[PDB]
Design a protein around this ligand. Structure first.
Ligand code: SF4
Ligand code: SF4
Ligand code: FES
Ligand SMILES: [Cl-]
Ligand SMILES: [Cl-]
Ligand SMILES: [Mg+2]
Ligand SMILES: [Mg+2]
Ligand SMILES: [Mg+2]
Ligand SMILES: [Mg+2]
Lengths: 626, 628
């Protein structure tokens, strides 16, 4: 099928799309076609529903009519408020994630979280000391955890002048944020202030709205997400390099297949632990399975990969196709980026669709709510549901289409520094010498507007060919992994300088750094490099790219990268092109404010050209002559 | 007016006169733009459109081929509409949240000695509120120590560690128990807003019932959190309202004075503007410029506040705001945030009027920004008044048309003022309800909306209710409506039924009690909670109602939602953008009755709205066993 071929570059996606068509199962691609053409006002951002004097639409008419909303707001204000609420939704997605990790560490510190513990005590004491906990090196671990919990919760309060982890940013960058009124103060506060500013008759200046959009996103990258990453390492272990596999072939016909979907390792890590209990394994054996096979989807899959080496079944647009294999006995979901279509596709099979979060409710799902105090009991119950579902699997409808592809994961900053000998100097020396021209974080989603992973893979291949090391997070992990680029042998696909450094270190030219929350690791790495060199992040040869993004979370990441000084490419435009002034600020004006700007470019080769050009300009401003 | 169009836009002569003047001068008004935006987009109107990711944007249609039944992610009309309504409520809750937060920061600055010109105006209320919320020895410790501890309690409600907001303890136990089992208990003022934005991200909360339950939780975090903190701390800093006389309508502007209109919500600004205008050297500068004096007049909620606490006359409500500039006598607008139409900047530029912004959150392209904070407000507000005096020297006398004589009103009915008028306890009020002299109470709290002839429904409903012996509690835009109708004075007892007239005359109060700004709808919650606790019943058992006949804003929807979720039947004149989902609509109008003991009503006929509100009151009186 030419239609099926154009929807993905991967054979496992093609096979399941053929199977879905034969069974009459509609997919995300089919509904994307139904929603094309899109509403032009919605696509341009020139529409507002923020009060019932409206709703309003804006046009650029020579007769002057419909230039303003009923309240008098123009296209610049309307577009900027819509973009601000878009970013606020993304920041909120990460904020609640981080909040749940604080709650879990608190429960551990109180001794009220059976099955949870502090699995990286050394990092707990290091992070606590970094953030000002007294005597963090020597006091009892649960006391230190309690004080760290208080620091993190206070960043979710309204009394700080700056978030705790913001101290990692170089002084020049913190001074810039302070002058601009961009310093993030509270993780929830900035989100709430964005919703206030975008109410009718509050903030009606597009520049002011975009500045607070930056502040809101910064409260994610340096707050909600960074707290989420660092406490996740403390509770579940700091990632270290390890081998795994990727694609739909990680599912096993002879096993109970449990797919974890969403973002919360507080659930997926306890699901994994339940599948390892002797009586649970025995129940699977008694049902006829060879054993129990946990496989990851989305960000929670990324995190199980980073910390446990659990193979990943696929990324965003693979999620429906994973069920169509007919071998998914249960989907265990928490929250964010979980398409509700999965509930209906699971209903075409035996698959149990289990929700676990009070925030991730799906009509028709089997809800087994998980909290730290009951997770060990509840996750055992969920695995037993999966084993029962396995007994009802129809063998005539099973088709697992591929052989899994080997990958290497686990490149936390701690792992990178260890591979470098303990200091960033060997990496800095390679950048100075020109063996590594720079670094690009490729961090985006999938989007039905783009042939799945075609841009993700092409950009990754282009950058490493040009001696630009790629840091991969989120959906891009599966893309690069299936492309064979997440292994040390992929140094053969890099340019001569990057290949030599990778082979000297024994690492791939593409480093898996985790989930979308773990883009905070990229912020930490940039801050460390800038601080070591005595410059701003906006002076580093770095970039970020989201070639196939779709979510509000992805836009929030892009915004906090830009606001932190990282040039950021998007494959597709946000819904802002109805305002030339807002668009010009995003693409150009922000350069003269925060030292970086957005780029929109659907050709991944041209995107590589633009990212390299920024890196070349940054190298020149550092005076590098190589 | 002789123009049928102009007559159709408002019931008031001062609005008619300025609409004629605006048209003659080529000034476009909110009504003109409302016509340009009619007809509206059908999907936006119905709520069946989604822009929450760029897999979309999506529209939900009812087609024969079954296409466009779902968004690209698979979400149906119920989820999309519920998420849109949830973000709508969160925007309104956030409007009040930041307001309340700024009052905490101001009280903190006073407690620290870092707010020149600000004091604790009501120390007795400070000690009472602090003791109520658990401050140790609030009755005896130094006032600034007590204030610092109250500040900490309020800030903790803007944190993430509480199981329930501090003021929620005012609600009856039966209501708190119900919220707890529903998962509706508000925990943190900012937290519920942030969680709503998380739930409405693609692929998070995809159950319309869950989404509406959290919308109720988010709104409750406003009414019992952001707004109630705002009200109580505003009383502490600026005084508890007491009954007093004032005036309303565009005739409160003075041709012979420097006219300064305060607009927005923040008394932290308006009280210091007023203080600056009373300084002898500032008054002398105005007189040296040719003015008799400086004349402060209120708009919107900050006008409501200055009326309640200082008796400052109010120039008008929402749809009067553009028309106030068209008088040609507005020498300055001093704005802070919320419900300030950006059209006012352009209309001000048609005149001499200075448009001054004061909040880092309320930025308007082209405005004169003079940012106000507690530490500099005394100095900055003086600078702002001097800007107004300078603007006055540039006023064109030939373009001045102040069209009416002001109407006398009575304001200041805080709960403290009501209880004092009753002799100290609610018992005489309860006795009048039991005796059937007052059948019940309705808060009329809404906005204006160009979809409805200005104040036609506000005034008709108010008249209908008091005629039926239902006392009206008026806040927000309705204050100006009831005031211009002559209903905010004790003599208006003649317009009420026999029972309400007798009670009003025995107390010397109007049949319509002005209880303040939109933040002060928290006073109505406190009153309902007090009556329910005193009677030993739920708020859902009281003969009460709420009504927003001409609403427009997200803030107004959040107020309506927290009224419903607290057990108060709530009427809206116009539907929220939800009718594209029958299930969400049915939940709002009917299903919530069997969840929280109250529901929304949508009814554009104010007489029929009166019938529906009365029928609820009749049923609650029956459930209380009243036979009168
Ligand atoms: S806020 Fe202004 S532009 Fe938006 S819907 Fe309301 S009147 Fe229209
Ligand atoms: S969240 Fe779902 S319904 Fe909304 S725009 Fe995205 S794909 Fe469409
Ligand atoms: S659907 Fe209403 S403007 Fe796009
Ligand atoms: Cl004292
Ligand atoms: Cl509590
Ligand atoms: Mg706990
Ligand atoms: Mg500022
Ligand atoms: Mg302060
Ligand atoms: Mg619950």
């Amino acid at each position: 099928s030419k239609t099926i071929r154009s929807r993905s570059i991967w054979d496992d996606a093609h096979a399941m799309l053929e199977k879905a068509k034969a069974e009459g199962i509609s997919t995300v691609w089919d509904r994307a076609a139904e929603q094309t053409p899109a509403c032009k006002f919605c696509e341009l951002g020139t529409t507002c529903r923020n009060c019932i004097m409206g709703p309003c639409r804006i046009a650029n008419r020579k007769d002057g009519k419909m230039r303003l909303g009923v309240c008098g707001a123009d296209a610049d204000v309307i577009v900027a408020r819509n973009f601000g609420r878009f970013i606020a939704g993304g920041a909120a997605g990460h904020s609640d994630h981080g909040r749940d990790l604080i709650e879990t560490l608190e429960a551990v510190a109180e001794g009220k979280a059976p099955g949870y513990t502090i699995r990286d005590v050394a990092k707990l004491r290091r992070i606590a000391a970094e953030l000002g906990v007294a005597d963090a090196a020597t006091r009892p671990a649960h006391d230190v955890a309690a004080d760290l919990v208080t620091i993190c919760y206070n960043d979710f309060g309204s009394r700080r002048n700056a978030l705790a982890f913001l101290a990692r940013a170089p002084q020049v960058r913190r001074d810039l944020w302070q002058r601009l009124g961009m310093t993030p103060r509270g993780v929830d506060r900035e989100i709430a202030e964005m919703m206030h500013r975008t109410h009718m008759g509050c903030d009606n200046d597009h520049t002011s709205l975009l500045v607070h959009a930056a502040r809101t996103a910064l409260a994610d990258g340096w707050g909600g997400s960074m707290i989420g990453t660092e406490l996740s390492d403390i509770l579940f272990g700091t990632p270290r390099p390890r081998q795994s596999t990727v694609n739909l072939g990680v599912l096993r016909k002879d096993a109970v297949n449990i797919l974890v979907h969403g973002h919360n390792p507080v659930v997926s890590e306890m699901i994994l632990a339940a599948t390892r209990e002797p009586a649970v394994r025995q129940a699977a054996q008694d049902a006829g399975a060879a054993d129990i096979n946990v496989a990851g989807l989305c960000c929670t899959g990324n995190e199980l990969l980073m910390r446990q080496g659990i193979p990943m079944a696929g990324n965003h647009l693979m999620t429906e196709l994973a069920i169509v294999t007919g071998a998914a006995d249960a989907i265990v979901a928490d929250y964010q980026c979980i398409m509700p279509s999965l509930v209906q596709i699971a209903a075409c099979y035996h698959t149990r669709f289990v929700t676990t979060s009070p925030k991730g409710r799906f009509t028709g799902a089997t809800h087994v709510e998980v909290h730290p105090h009951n997770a060990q009991e509840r996750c055992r119950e969920i695995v037993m549901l999966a084993i029962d579902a396995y007994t009802r699997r129809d063998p005539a409808r099973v088709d697992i289409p591929s052989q899994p592809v080997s990958i290497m994961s686990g490149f936390s900053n701690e792992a990178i520094l260890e591979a470098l000998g303990g200091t960033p100097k060997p990496l800095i020396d390679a950048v100075v010498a020109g063996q590594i021209r720079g670094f690009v974080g490729i961090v985006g989603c999938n989007n039905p507007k783009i042939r799945q992973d075609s841009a993700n893979v092409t950009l990754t291949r282009e950058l490493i060919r040009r001696d630009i090391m790629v840091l991969a997070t989120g959906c891009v992990t599966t893309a690069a992994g299936k492309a064979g680029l997440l292994v040390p042998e992929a140094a053969s696909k890099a340019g001569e300088g990057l290949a030599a450094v990778c082979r000297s270190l024994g690492v791939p030219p593409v480093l898996h750094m985790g989930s979308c929350v773990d883009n905070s690791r990229i912020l930490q790495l940039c801050a460390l490099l800038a601080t070591t060199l005595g410059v701003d992040i906006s002076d580093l040869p770095v970039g970020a790219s989201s070639p196939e993004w779709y979510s509000e979370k992805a836009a929030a990441i892009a915004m906090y990268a830009v606001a932190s000084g990282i040039p950021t490419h998007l494959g597709l435009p946000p819904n802002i092109l109805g305002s030339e002034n807002v668009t010009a600020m995003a693409l150009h004006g922000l350069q003269d404010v925060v030292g970086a700007a957005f780029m929109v470019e659907p050709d991944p080769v041209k995107a590589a050209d633009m990212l390299e050009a920024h890196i070349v300009a940054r190298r020149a401003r550092l005076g590098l002559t190589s």
